[model samples]
Target: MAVKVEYDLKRLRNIGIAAHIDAGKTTTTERILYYTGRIHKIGEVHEGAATMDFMEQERERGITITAAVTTCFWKDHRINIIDTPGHVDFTIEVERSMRVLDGAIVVFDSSQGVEPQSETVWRQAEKYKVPRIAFANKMDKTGADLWLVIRTMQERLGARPVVMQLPIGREDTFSGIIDVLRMKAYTYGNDLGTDIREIPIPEEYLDQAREYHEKLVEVAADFDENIMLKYLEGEEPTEEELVAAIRKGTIDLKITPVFLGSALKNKGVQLLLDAVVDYLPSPLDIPPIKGTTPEGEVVEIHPDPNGPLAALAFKIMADPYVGRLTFIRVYSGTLTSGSYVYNTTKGRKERVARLLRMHANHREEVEELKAGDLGAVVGLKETITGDTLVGEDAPRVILESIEVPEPVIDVAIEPKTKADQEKLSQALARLAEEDPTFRVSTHPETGQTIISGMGELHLEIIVDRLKREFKVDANVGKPQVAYRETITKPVDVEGKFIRQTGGRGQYGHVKIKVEPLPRGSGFEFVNAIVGGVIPKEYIPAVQKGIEEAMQSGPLIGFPVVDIKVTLYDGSYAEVDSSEMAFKIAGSMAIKEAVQKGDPVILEPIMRVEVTTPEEYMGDVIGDLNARRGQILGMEPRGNAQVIRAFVPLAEMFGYATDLRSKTQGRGSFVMFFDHYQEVPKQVQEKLI
Candidate 1:
């Protein structure tokens, strides 16, 4: 039989579930899988058995490190869900997930509201312009307040939340959720989330439900003129009308429909899933995927199975059963098994030996992946994350790739024994290929293998994976900040390399102007030479030489950044000068220019948020100040205080343990790389 399309294009949903740590994202995902019959039983995150968190490290830590993709069927629609990580270190996981998803379900702890990482994930979603609906989770916990969550979404996230459901009772008595649009209450009799009872609005919650219902109608009216006209005439619109308006608003990214539930307690999960199908957009509803052909023509690839193939490989995984799996989302056309496709980004043809639909670690073989389908392809040897895959005969269109963040922390690692040295290198290479944020390099002087990642935990997990997955024993050193160097002023310098000792004399001369750019501007090169002062063929060699020279700065040997180099004048002997000589001259010129232009060390500054009990507020602030932190502000959050600050990563070493001891293990903090700042004079002196 031919490949069977299980769901119509309009009935398919490609979405992700993301949130802050401990917001019950995995638990929510488990419930979704359970209710949709994708899984036979629910696995709790605390129990280390959640299907979405399939990695051993994830199970041990009770946090997702990588995004997991799974497909389920609900209400005759195929919902492909990618459960993303919440921890700050694994933000690339969330970033890439948002890049591929058309919509998202942002989960929030009812008590915590919008947290630090919550704001981060919210910004990620907003950056991608992905429409989303908010789920106020963990309503059974103490201090659970739906209104508080809504307010935080408004104030912190700057999101317009249209409250669709209100809790009947909260904090230990959170029994059910009142559907504002339907004017009904759904109470669960058991914790398994199977016995849901829909009843008329309760007596005590009837007024509150009506109020939120009116508010929902008002918000929906902004999107639907029909609803607006009806509301203006004091006429209540039908439930279908309200839903259509809300759907329109959500898809347009005008507002987020809020739904409350306790995923851990298995209350109101079914309604959340229903709302997902009701409000979220399908692949067909989103704008066509934008891409550029090899000839620089922009085109929008709409979802059409018969159209030219255009798919994006969003993730790469090393599976034990399948050697390599490239997770791809097909925006148009069909991909068949054992077919050859061109990787537009890499400019290589790869064969799809097999097509598999992934459910966590499990897989289902498939014949073909149609438009709007998300699946993994086997036997893709050269493809990587963010690579665009298309039919070999189709237009060579390259889609916009995912932006990768720079690694802020690095650690030196070595094999414990010579037997494991080769294995270590192989393993690290594979990992670096799988994760764009994880980089592996050798120290220029020390020749030690250094692995850099987004954070300490990120490197720790990399070491752990090396031992567990690759069967390599390695020793890791303390975490180090990935500092950089940049010039402070402008200077003109000359570099000349002339040698006449050998049969072929080498002669290369260059004059360059080096200037400092704004922070985070990175490196820029300008070719200002005129009239063959430097041959065009040799110009690239000079630029390449400069790039290599930037790998190690003059001060502290760190990578140089935020500097511009202009090649104004140069000389080369036609018979003796080669690309090598010019490259060496360029490298020499940059080194001299940087030293003369006054270079400074730049350290990664982190935006840190610490939440501690009220009693430890003073001590926490004192400790942060001791770490050279510049406190931005402080505010009360629930029963605790949140301190926001910008601190150097160099001073943040072992901060987690330090904060725990200072606050008696009752404080928590989240930090991400904000920007790079010049090191203090004293700090620079000590480093020198």
Candidate 2:
């Protein structure tokens, strides 16, 4: 394939397609790739041949495990689209993708409206300040209601949705859309919607289109002074003026233009592509990237090819062919092969071996990539996700890094054989490099290699990938919740270590105070020793030892948190007291303080939302209540009932089977780990 050489920053759009699970995100991306002439055939995700769903596990599971990146051209504008996963298990994929994208297409299920995971990705996008439009897909499914979904966006997402196109017909009769700004109706002709033909608006749907067009223009005017002036003068704006106003409003995030389509039936996708070119912003339209220097000075970086190099590695993969592929979004200058780019985040320099333009798993080798381009580099040894790379000069600024969530679920994993054990360790190392939520660790008491992740399904997929991708056979243990421990009171304790050896005597003494802190404050250590009661050089050793002690609490081996330690007084022997002795004494001191202070066990609580038919509502609610769930609320969703509650993870071990039994396999649920709370006294006693 011949790639376009000429480039324009103003004509480039970096965007991602994000939505809830089974909401047609991958199907929509496949259609976009086909219509852009990037591929000859369209692949359906259900059939497991989608272009972006390249991973073997993704094809088998029929869900995206990672964000897939690709580049294509439409109307002389280059678009770099990242299709992000909808499952909360792969939420880190969405978070990293949105961090580098300038805009997004927020897809919603027409029948289901704004689902749970959709809101999670929406909040992630909002945190990055990315502008986006709402796409109500799956309009051809039964009970598909476009307006209902649009209203849900307003009520649930706090979005001021402006309809750009109105569906001509409801479910089963849905075929095309009426473009509001153009005042024209477009329907697909033969060929699975390849050939689009314009037609006159039907009399039955004329009134609805007209009303929405008026509302669209009204909201668009709020962002454009000229459009507002014309509206005030009692004059209608031209089509060009209307488009300009809507584009301005979309970029300003003042209003979200909603487009209804059926990606499976191939309806209204071309119009959606046109809307992307007209409405979504280019790199030049976004604010300058801000960063602080290593010395704490702030600097602003814009998309300028002539400026010093600054690129962000948003993703890293252990590819079978390329060894390692580092996906980067060029933010400042051009990058060429054989050139050195300093890894500012890692504080090292690396030589770029090869640069390639990505089309999912396929690659188009390129010599150089300029500003505002998304490409992957091969053979970057040390760079990982969230690292920034700069050219030539030393790092003057450090870009903001991606915020990752801690894993909440754990399972012990073991290889079946000695040869498999070595392969499993190597495979897990590679897997952990690719995903931030997946963690590998060794259990202290059991001496088993434990793998932790966001959910049971998350760790399941990982184990499956190990077998399929790395050819490692492993045995897995029952899923366990990752629990934490914390102190509930304040106490001061004295720890003295006196050991007499044949050569020299060791003596170290310290008085430490421990107090409980608010949840999520993490561990804090203060040196309030007034004078040099403890030598200045030995303070770090004490802090280190304190941190080590927090790893295992007196109540249990769970890591402790939300505690503050103050070293107020201590006495040290000039000859006998060494850094090693202070470290041992410090570790001993905090352990004693925690024992005197009052410790408690904290268990993870999960926020669960279940949707079931009205017939099974009573049974589902009863099952949740039986699990010690605290019901938050219940609401009517279409013909179904949606119940939301917070339940302890310990009681939710086999919730999937229980939910299926109660609802007769007609119910579905989504859950995420919430904050930790105190365990009941009875439960704690049983645990002990």
Candidate 3:
């Protein structure tokens, strides 16, 4: 057992702010920092001065390019908040942030409620078992309905929404919020809502507040046995008892405590901060973290500062002035500056030359970090994103890494001069290390360096970064679709390699079976030889060759997926039939079988969601139908309509420009790769 220290882990809260695009996540973060006295003044995103949107690209585009981590104090509780991007392009930031957080504050546009990407982040939070509270933001906006937002949370996120705060007024009149748990109303004073005044419950909103308050108590009672008993006995529970029960259920993920506010207007933010400290769990409240040894042994690390060190590096930032900074979350034990930590993931010992507490892009050198804290380690050469570091005396334990998505779009990139070529390669390598979704590789057919990413905007930003950040001038080709090939029928074929040279004769024979698999199963290889017909040492060579053949299929040289290859029989000469001979035979066998197996071209299908006014509904629907899009559903959302469809990714290139033209810049859409579907015979013929 590891020894525990006297550090107060209960005072720390690790949380993130997640939402769809334009949901005011950054605005809320700025306000939180100002109110907590972490910053002297508040900055707005529209003005391009938001503190959390630290990157120049982020501020210029008014969009968060990466997750920003900062620390603040609220009511004596230390809060480490990660403000993540809302765009689907940088979704990996949210995914990895949630993996390390204990709880989250999911912000929703009070007018639009649950948007498409909201569903994506909600699923990610659930996947990581992170409990969260809902903040119905933008209450000052027109058509902002708090009730509708609550209803959507139940319908869409499948959460039991318990209203903890009732808005005092509607849009434009939104001034204060009534705390249902405390039975008080808080109205903000001047100085950007830093001054709060507790007033009597407004007579007009008293009835509605009581209704929600009673409902909140009922929901809270349902999760705690003692509270339920008190309710059944007709005994009123004290405010402390009720709030304790709510916190218990929230930590257990049984229910979500809902709050309302307009972060930009500074209304109800103070109370929201209070709810965070009151309801969300600290590191001590969370269960012990689990890890695995290199030898497959299981271990648990309690949140103890004196325990053997175990920390996970979740992010890597390539700063021009500071080289590289690896952001890490300490799960157990203490990490001190100038000490050595073992990187169990990479099997290298990294020296901690310096440790700094990060506030977005800014940093302050720290002497040491203990469990339940977040900090950045500088001058570490071997550590990277998703690496686990342990103390020298600790066991070799590796943490689960982040799950990265494959690239769906590719473009060929070239430099203008030979001097820039090596620089461009170095730039791409550094960027790839920073982003998991972005990839760089050589196109097998053209021998050109190809870069691939989640979408057009993703790769575009990468190109922009190469020029602005690295000062490397480069040229990029048009975006190309990532096509795949798959077989339609099963076929068996045999390949023979027989050659008689001067020194020795080469002979190798193989029988293989090729068959189609369910889509998205990727590639599979099987060895079905019996009685040692093919030596075991040569089996790996055969599989490697078969896999290599799948890289560039016969049709259009696209990679082949959703297929299986089996080696049933093979003959080898003892003297001449080496691994090379067997490898050649295997490749020959797969190529011949795939040609007869009836291969078909496949394209990725995207889940596209368009938001437009009611008048342009028919035109948008017609245009999508012409592109062979499958309309999934449509619903009214805040004086407009949201149309969801499944369209081929091939048709979505340059769609942003097309959509703006179609609706006179009033229509907007968000699309992501959903799955792969077969292309029509006519389209396939044109491609081949």
Candidate 4:
């Protein structure tokens, strides 16, 4: 049996829905699925039945933890949507989803405007150059001001928002929306979102509608010459001309078209879907995917089903039924089930046993996937996230991989019983394989298993999964800061490893210079050897040795970072020198150099934001100050005061309970890893 492509590349849209917590992203996604006929019945987020949030952990916590992919049809266009998490602990989920999406719908709380995490995700979208449109959700909530939302978008995100629709009524009376571009009104009779009636603009709101429509035309003129000429002659442009202009601007990332909606109330979602088709870019509209061949030559992969196969595995999930499911996005050619494919990144061949199209947790088997299609493949044994999949005999090119963030918080874990130790390790390895940000390492000296992740909540979820998914009980210790060490000055040192034995002798000598680097610069090794002082074949051994040395710094045993090492001079015995000898010499050299180069321990600092009532502002600031926090600034959001600060992660343990006590449970805070700073001498003494 064969499966024919139902939609052409030009009629496909790949988009993501992202926003801050409680900004109604999942609800908006649910509404879109409902209106598109993909789901006959609607599910509400508060009731924990949203289709995209299919995980039991997500339903119980009322938060999306992983990015969920689903496909739906609207107006003959195939739309593949990825609903990403809003929590900062799961930012990696959003980061990877943004890397593959052509466009995004960034949801915003109309009353709250651009929030802390909203800005974070906005920056992520900008990093990937993903064109996006803004949806001001929760219009039915009190203090829902679309203009205020627009202003915050401009001021905070530095975005140019072109208003497309205006709410018909204020909060509590919000019943419909005015289409500014078309100069029409769509009023909803009930919350069912089925009986939408197009009527004339109300008399009292006619002037306001005209003002916004004129503003829309003015913005459209900036992108189209025809609109410009029409505007100059005081003539009206046709709706098609305006739509074309807006589409061009949006695809070019020049403007963000803003739409208003209350997804929970089932109003304005249909129009949002229409905008997705009219304004968002198709797969054919984006530039060709860039990749590099194994020979170090760059190539562009265009969407052509007849071309050589090229796809990227962006995610990996372990399913009980299917074993391991590798989610892939085909960029070119066709991928057939029961065929052989090459993994360029891993340099291995894998057999595709089956292909399935995913709708949240549900799957429908497909015989083959064509260019620009998103689906999952089974029977891939060696493929992981960010791996490139290509035809066995095709061009050996590797697409760019997704960047994974380093984990900042760690905790020691032990099995509750001896029987669970083996299962615990198996469960952790599986989870770590699925998520890049979750790292599992064993302490070299103490023999303790330490699990690290983006934040406390991230590790908490991992532990919770260990018990539920794998049936392994574990006891977790207090969270620990992932401190690092870096040198403040440069130093040159020599390492010599010489052993005189009866039969064979070992001799290796190396001279290296260690220098400090800027924060987040990471480790860099330079080969400055001349005249073969160090053998050509042994150079890699030296670099590897230095890397091993950096794993556990001399100062307090923390990992070293932000340092550069140069191997300028060394001596090797031709007959006695070996790779192992050189490796030991290099490791010995770096350890000595760091001790003399003014080494210091650095702690992770977090960017913290707290929103609290005015009455508790003093207590909040005082508590933060006592933690050695630096106040960045303060502003007013609605009726609460928002405080921004940078505090060391070591002092933020158990902050949730403390914040509740300080603000009488009226205050909430969100923090994410910012950077690393040198700890004070007293703190260093205590840590050492």
Candidate 5:
């Protein structure tokens, strides 16, 4: 196929459907596809295949675990739709999807209301400061309550929801929604796309629609004085005024408009789409791109073509066909093929080899992308996610980067053979380049190659991808906590090593003082020698040696942290006390000092939150306690109980499966690194 021109962003809306695991987001996306005439029929999520989530692993597991972006046209608008992974274990998908999309539809189950993961992503979207709308899906399911769910959004997510449409019936009787502004009813029938005809509301549902319409008007008019005063004077407002009020409130995010629907039944999607056009913000309405100046000044990227080119790099992919494709949202100026842009993050220049608009795995090449456009480019070597691409060659501005969470879980991975070893590192590096959560490091003491990630599943997927996608065969050892070594006491010592050979003589002497630092204060090096016993040039070598010692502690196979080393005095022989000799002496001195200063191994601790049925609260807390966890707090979570606690990383290797079994798959949780603390006496006895 020939490269097509860029899709106009004004006629486009890049959106992600995000929610809790079972909130029916995939169902919602299927409905959007059906209504827009993109798919001939909707696929069932329970049946293991949804259009957006095409991964076989996801289908087999019956869970969405990857962020999949698809394209569909709605009312002549090119909608780039991304359905995010809903499992708490795969939240990086939500973060990545929202970082690139212009808007989000926060879907929720009608009766369950605000689920834990929904609240988690809500805060994440707030961190990105995205504009969003909420939909209570599964309205036709048993025990559905539209108002209660909307109220949950208001209370838990702290969103002021203005109802855009109200469902006409409950449970199986659910048929359609009444658009609040237009005061019209739209109903869809079983052909999947037919019966989606607009008509007047039936008399039976007219009163309920009018009842909520006033609430919608009340919230919308708050942002528009004319509408507020007109309503206060008992003067009926025009349909245009109602829309303008709601539109203003929506763009400003003062209120998030909620619409109820059964995405599986294709009941309220058309009105939801209409509200999307009216409520969800357009890219042009967002503030200009924000960045720091080369001179440390704050600069604004105006949404005008004449302004300097400012493209925010959001999606970084290691595409085999494209060789590192970057998704950029152009804020100002225009991007064309062959144009060179400065990568402010890497401080390098790169040529835009090809520009294309993406539709799943397919794309259409485009020549020029103007402001408010999202497009991808191939052949960028230095640009990565969160990098700002600017036109200023020498003095380009870099936008603030996203702070990715450190991978808490770690594994020791090694190649199956010598040839696999050579290719394994290359594959891992490429994987790291694409995923911010995956980290590759080495343990000097044990000589083990370690891979760290968000959770067990996160690392499992990475290892699977390495073997399946990158063609690297490797074996992984049992999971281990990425521990650290630190000193608890202070001491002074002298390290002297002299070797005499028949041909030459080698000698180096060093005196170093060590002190313990408070928790979290990383290793610090100090030079307190009164005379130049060790030359200035030799100090860096000594520091380098100390750095090496920090990596390979004597007692345990873990990196050392939170200690200070001072080189007080040392002698350097003119011929034999070379940089290498002093480095060795320094390394020897630090190792001896750590032994005398009471070195201790520290393990990572994580703050874990478990949400389970109320009946399972005791069992959940008991399991955590069995892991040697310290209970921090306990609170009620909807119909479940949430237990918050801190536990060691070693105790959480397969906590997901354990929790699932304990709660019969009705439990969910989130864990993140809290800090590193000394291992208990019993634990330290078994240290490696």
Candidate 6:
């Protein structure tokens, strides 16, 4: 018979492992699980059961496509580890997961140092205010330099990494590390990486290790008086005290504690696990999570069972078999089965029918959950991302929502037949509801329905789901650039309609002034008329008419933006001029106003950032320039070059596929909506 351990919330640690693609974050997680006895043996990323990545696509591709959670017992601590995807295409998962984690372990490649995703994930940590420890992984790989890696972090991300352990050797000879404070060497897997040995420091590496040790001591002494006193008197702080000081200082973000080792070979993992227990923050260590009360008062909630129940729904999974599942992290208080919780955002009630601690796609049903614990519940229709589940009277605390990117690429989709069309709309709607970033809309003028997504693959998968899961065949058009329009200058125009043929003839007159707003200002309507030039009740009708006409602009069939319409003066009939007549008259007035107001075609502009090897930067810059992109600048990040540019969205019809081919899958880029800009005259002629 196996013994089940009861969970103790105080000893629990919820942490995430995040890094750039191919940086071995998942590999490091496998090593931790193997060493912690959670699994009998380690399943490396190249293998199928990396534990953190259990999905078939993830296993087949050997890349983390989604964020996964795993639970393991290590060093008197029940750690709930979230292994986050580092791929830029799947960064939404990383952003949402970090919001719920108490701390994180930032993994890095030895040679790559600080890659694009590294800087991105670090910024996410800053945005979430998550405390973390740095793991300098892949030391066994060639060209791996501990000092150089730290330097890159400081230079690129503005993070100062403090040395906790100095390696005994470089490159392939790297077998052991000298615990800097104790000035002793510790080696791992002596024979075929089988033995763990601790030997005195060698003369060859003594000076290098000693110099780094001195710097480490200087950093520690400022935060700890005992260490400073000893160092000043020509004495060394004990390994225990030094490690403690590093842990405390690290959680404060005064310094980032860097640990060295190759996780693939199962080296230095024990030390890293010990660091996890010692350095990473606990729920109690985190500041009280602040949220708004129902009455709109600000309140802070601590992680305590006695504290009012509060949980943030971070990740949402739409399972075909079980329906929708919401994965929530308990930030405060405890929740058990059958407990009634209030949906602060939805203003509804949900029963905690079952609470299960999830392990990747698997789950372990638990009776209750405490602070810093992650659990999922099924059939919670009201609970979605950013919604707070708390007590009925608990203040209205709305957790920050995910900043999902707007759809950059869209494909016109049509059902195969009339029956499929009927079901396609419903199926697409359900998918859009589940994923905020995925959108589907029917263009009013063209009468064509289009589905948009974050990227090509993102849209491909949803279309695949429509066929496989929804059982509806969908025909998709070529990928198209999503665009918009806006006016260039200001002008006033008149719209009149007077027909007197029979009794009760029609008469309406309206003059509108259309002013162009700044880019991204969107549409605005104003009633500048006074003295009942247009009746107050009819003013709304005039604005509505103008708005309807702006949907499909005069030149191209794109939505208009950055324009303002005002009914400065207009006449309404007392008996003959009906609201319908005025509405039509106002709509005409806007069309005339826009045509005469120096109408210009406004194309969507996207903020584009590309990361590629330095050698390919020249070609990339030239290519972007040909597409009407304004090159912002280029900067060195890790071993690669980053090019920032802003380009019109229409110019990026097949940029994703072209970029991948250009860099041979070594380069990546992301483009999000920045604002709308007038299309150049030459480009506008060819666009329509």
- Give the whole-model CA lDDT for all candidates, comma-separated: 0.68, 0.67, 0.67, 0.68, 0.65, 0.64
Q: Supply every candidate's count of residue pairs whose N, Cα or C atoms clash at under 3 angstroms.
A: 0, 0, 0, 0, 0, 9
lDDT tens digits, residue span 431-505, model 5: 666666567778777555876677555665665565455667767887776577888788887766677654667
User: Can you give the TM-score per candidate against the true fold?
Assistant: 0.65, 0.66, 0.66, 0.66, 0.66, 0.67
Candidate 6 residue-wise lDDT, 239-343, digit = tens: 666677767776666776677766556665554555566766556555557777767888766556556667777667665644766778776666676566566
lDDT of candidate 2 over 1-688, digit per residue (tens): 1234426445667766655434555545665566565473323342321123234344323245334555566666666655454444565556656666767666655665564445656778787777777666667667778777677877886667777676777677777777765567878755467457888778776777788677766776787877779888888666788788767777777776677766665554554666677877766555456666767777656565556667777666556787777778776666776666566657776778888866554676777775566678876765777666665532454544667755556667877776887887777666766666667788767556876676545555565565456777777876666678888888998667779765888776778899988866678878887657666778888777888889987776678888888888888876787767788888888886786787878888889877776657666556667788786887756556777888887776564324335443235567889888777757675775
Worst 10 residues of 4 by lDDT: 44-53
Clash count for candidate 1 is: 0
Model 3 agreement with the true structure over 126-145: per-residue lDDT tens digits:
77788877666767677778
* Backbone clash tally (model 6): 9
TM-score of 1: 0.65
Candidate 1 lDDT (Cα, whole model)?
A: 0.68
lDDT of 4 by residue, 99-190 (tens): 66667666656665564445556767888888877776677777778887778777766667777776777666677777765778888766
TM-score of 4: 0.66
List the lowest-lDDT window of 10 residues for candidate 6.
47-56
Q: Write the per-residue lDDT of candidate 1 for residues 1-688, one digit (tens) a residue.
A: 1225634455666666655444556545664566555463323342221222234444323345334555666665555655454444455555656765767666656765554445556777877788877666677778777787678778866667777676777876787777875779877777576468887777787887788777877887888999899988899777788779877887778887677767665554544566667877666554456678777877657566666777777667666777777788776777778887666667777788888876554677887776667788888864677667776545656644556655656667767776787786776666666666577778767556876666545555565555456778767776666677888889998777777646788877878999988765677988886646565678787888888888888777788887888888888876888767787878788888888898888888889877776657666666677788787887755556777888887765654324325543235567799888877757685776
Best by TM-score: 6
Candidate 5: minimum summed lDDT over ten consecutive residues — where? Answer: 45-54
lDDT of 3 at 66: 38
Could you report the Cα RMSD, in angstroms, for every candidate shown?
A: 12.1, 11.7, 11.5, 12.5, 9.6, 9.4
